[model samples]
Target: DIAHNLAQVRDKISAAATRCGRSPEEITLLAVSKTKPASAIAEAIDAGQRQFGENYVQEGVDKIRHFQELGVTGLEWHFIGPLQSNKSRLVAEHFDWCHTIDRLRIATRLNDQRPAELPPLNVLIQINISDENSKSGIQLAELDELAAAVAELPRLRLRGLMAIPAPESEYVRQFEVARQMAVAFAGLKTRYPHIDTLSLGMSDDMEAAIAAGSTMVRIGTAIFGA
Candidate 1:
């Protein structure tokens, strides 16, 4: 069932990309598996889904360990939630990517706590593009300073930006909002060699995000069902 759903989403992604004159290969699908069971995730993997995003630190790590215990390889785990101070080490030790890093302190902890043998943890600077009071991301202007600091951390790789824009009803509004992040990502790419991912869009706004140059899109409900 998930496999069929996965195929449909991929087809939609490809159609959107082609319509926008962008290659679907340039985009990646991050299955947001926060509350989903590991068996469900295993089904996704069986369908060739590799990148997964988790909202809770402990839950994410538990799933990561579950797969590790099963000897699953090539699965990339990403932490995409509001991170608290005390939980940075667990993230650094387990996740392949952290998409909600909005400050220097957490970046420093993730950098220091990252294991020496494992590759440097990939990090994305979360920007509050819409400036929502409830969101966890930095303002556009704060990016330069934080990015500089994060890049200098040897144990962390600065991958690029992530944002959850304010919900918009129309596709035109969604594209406009997503474009702002694309502009920021273009500027960042010029400065940082490792900057690549622009984690934007979700189930509803993905087409607009892909049209606006998002390299990665997070999808859930559609694939896993609500």
Candidate 2:
């Protein structure tokens, strides 16, 4: 079941990339494994998935350690949750990428906690493209300042921007929202040349996200059988 699902999702992603005039191989998928069991994750690894995303810090840490013990090789873990300042150290130590950093303080803490032997932690400034008060990322207007601050942190590398736009039933509207956010992401990338990833899209709107220039897409239910 896991292998079949992953293959289907890959095909969908490839089709989406082709529609956008980009190579399907250029786009990467981060399989989201928030509430899934370790057995399910192991199955995914056995089926050739190398990258996975987890939403909670401690849960992810425990899962990562367990997966390592179970002989999972070459797995790249991504933290894709609302990160708290206090948890930056663990995140820096355990995860390869963090996709929800929105404030300078968190970035500084992550940088300070990063170990010297480890490579710089990859970061994405989350943009609240929908302007939701309940959301975890910064507003669109605050991105430039946040980007500038993040760039100064030596232990962290600014990868690009991520956003959860207001959900829409219409595919075109979803594509437009992602495209508008991508425009803002492009502007930030111009200033921070190292920033290249645009982490957008999910189960429902990944095609739209690909069309809007997303290099990485976080997918869960579509592949995991919710």
Candidate 3:
């Protein structure tokens, strides 16, 4: 059944990508496996799913280590949750990509703490497009400052922007926010040639996001079940 869910998600990505004239391979499916045990992750991986995202620091690193000890090859871990100052090094050492980077301080720590033995970590600036009081992203106006700073850091490769924009019921509304996100991304991407990922969308808003040019879609509920 889990494998079935994975296939359906694949189909969605394929269809959506084709709809937008993109190859499905271009958009990564970051399985949000936070709170899910390694066994569940192993199942998805066995079914050819390699990339994943996690929300917590300890659990995320533990899974990465557990899989390593078990000789699980070729799994990519992305830290997708709000990160605290103290937790910086843990994520710095273990994860392959980070999708919640919203400040220069956190960016500095992650860059400095990253082990020299590993390649530079992939990172994206989180944008609080709606200016929600509860969100953990910078306003679009601040992207220039943060992007320049993060780009100059030695151990982090600033990929692009990530956003969990305010939810909307209408597809039209979702597109409006996501298109704005794409526009915001295009601005950065035009300036920085290496910037390639736009981390957007989730279970309910998949279609709108794909149409808006999201290079990567983070899916959890649709694959893992509520």
Candidate 4:
């Protein structure tokens, strides 16, 4: 079921990007495998999926290790969950990218713990564009300061900005919110050219995200069948 669904989703990606005057390859699909079994993931991989996102470090590490043993190659694992201070070491060792750095302390720890043999860990500063109390990202007001701090960490490269905007009542409102965030991310990229990735969108609003200059979109249910 996942294999067939994943293929159809890829086609959707291409069509959506084309409609927005962008290439499908410009947006990466991060199969959010949270709460899904390894077997489902294996099936998706068999259907040509390579990149995946996980919400928990311990669970993600186990899956990555298992998949590696199962002959999965060229997999890029992204840690998209909130980071606990104690989990930095395991995250540093296993994940290739992190999409939820909100504070300097966590960035520093991740930088210090990253293995020297591995290249710099790619990172994105999560911004709470909506300023919701329930969200985990840094407020928009603090992004510039945090971005500067993240830039100073040599072991962790500031890849770009990521946001989980408050859900809107309409699709137009969704696109507007994402576009505003992307403008902020674009400004960040201007100051720090290294900051390039815009981690946005999901199953419902990816079209809006891509139109707003998102370089990477995280799709879960659309591919895996919720």
Candidate 5:
């Protein structure tokens, strides 16, 4: 079932990208496995899904350790949840990427805690694109200040931006909001050479996101079920 669902999602991504005159290869599929078990993740790994996003720190670390002990290879773990200041070290030590970085304090902690042997941690500045009260990201006005500070840290590699825009029923509204992020991403890349990832979209707005130049799309319910 996982394999079949995975294949279908891939097809949808390919179709979505192609319709917008972009190659499917340009988009990275980040399977958001927040509440999923290791068994379910194993099936996804078997299906050739290498990248995953997790929303909880401890559960993510547990799963990461589980796979490590089992000798699973080529898997990348991204901490896409609200990161607390106290838990920065665990994330820096265990995860491959963090997509919820919004403040300089957390960035500094992650930098200090990053192991010397490992390469710098890849991070994305989460923008509250929709300005939602519940989301964890900086306002658009604070992007440059925070990014510049994050870039100063030696152990955290600032990778671009991530945003979960407020949902819209119509595709037109969705594309408009996604396009704004595309503009922001282009501006970011111009300032920072290593800025490449733009983590946007979920199952509901995948098409608009891809069309508007989202390099990574985090999909969960479609692949793992609700």
Candidate 6:
């Protein structure tokens, strides 16, 4: 059952938190519901999972509307994928959080289009810390300038950073890359005291990420099964 799966994932997260000397509540488990249908998401919601991550634009928007129509209020929708310029308006209007912003143009558009009636859209700057050709994010050097730029926008809130490091075989190696992410997050915190999130980690390397101070962990197949 999805509820059984969700409980198991939560147990694992709690165990990881204990290992890292942190509270399990400190980690926000963003359920990645990319290809999953509204029924799958509804199952999770009924199981008490509130926050969900969706990668595709139209599909996410449709699900958001679907849930609302079905009376699933208070479910937070987050866009957790590569965002296109043309899709900015829909994302801005719909998603509660954006976790893959890498450019000034995208940030500016999201900021401008966010509905004034709602609270400012939460955002995380995705950093290509691994410097991978296939990944999307800005470099560490470009982060502060963009951060400051986004901080000035009225309709967006610069929450923190997100990173998907290159895979490594050893556990220590995984922790090493995540450790650097912690250092970067620390520096960002010093400058922007309001910045309080580090959206790192996944189903595979969550222990390393939580140990390295990730405030939020994005989990997918582990909860839903492959």
What is the C-alpha local distance difference test score of each model? 0.92, 0.88, 0.90, 0.87, 0.92, 0.90
Which whole-number lDDT from 0 to 100 does residue 131 have in model 2?
A: 51
Query: In model 5, what are the clashing residue pairs, if there are any?
Result: none
Residue 58: error of model 1 in Å? Answer: 0.8
**Model 2, 87-182: lDDT tens per residue?**
878999989999999889888999999998888999999988875655688888888788888888888999898887777779989888999888
- Candidate 5 lDDT over 1-226, as tens digits, reads 8889899999999999999999999999999998989999999999999999999999999999999999998899999999998888899999999999988888888999999898899999999887565557888889988888899898889999999888788999889999989998999999787988999988999999999999999999889988
* Backbone-clash count (model 4): 0
Worst 10-residue lDDT window, candidate 6:
130-139
Against the hidden true structure, what lDDT does model 6 obtain?
0.90
Model 2 ranges off by over 4 Å: 131-133
As a whole number from 0 to 100, the lDDT of residue 184 in candidate 6 is 93
What's each prediction's TM-score? 0.98, 0.96, 0.97, 0.95, 0.98, 0.97
Q: List where candidate 1 sits over 4 angstroms from the true fold.
A: none
The candidate maximizing lDDT is 1
Instruction: Indicate whether candidate 1 or candidate 3 has the larger TM-score.
Output: 1
Candidate 3 per-residue lDDT over residues 174-220, each given as its tens digit? 98899999999999888796989999998788889999999889988
The residue-by-residue lDDT of candidate 6 on 20-139, one tens digit each, is 789988989989988888888888999999999999999999999998888878889889899999999999999999999899899999988998999999999999888566559888
User: How many collisions between residues are there in candidate 3?
Assistant: 0
lDDT (Cα, 0-100) at 120 in candidate 4: 92
Q: Model 3 — TM-score against the truth?
A: 0.97
**Two-way TM-score contest, 2 vs 5, winner:** 5
Ten contiguous residues with the weakest lDDT in model 1: 129-138
Each candidate's number of clashing pairs is: 0, 0, 0, 0, 0, 0
For every candidate, C-alpha RMSD to the true structure in Å: 0.9, 1.3, 1.0, 1.3, 0.9, 1.0
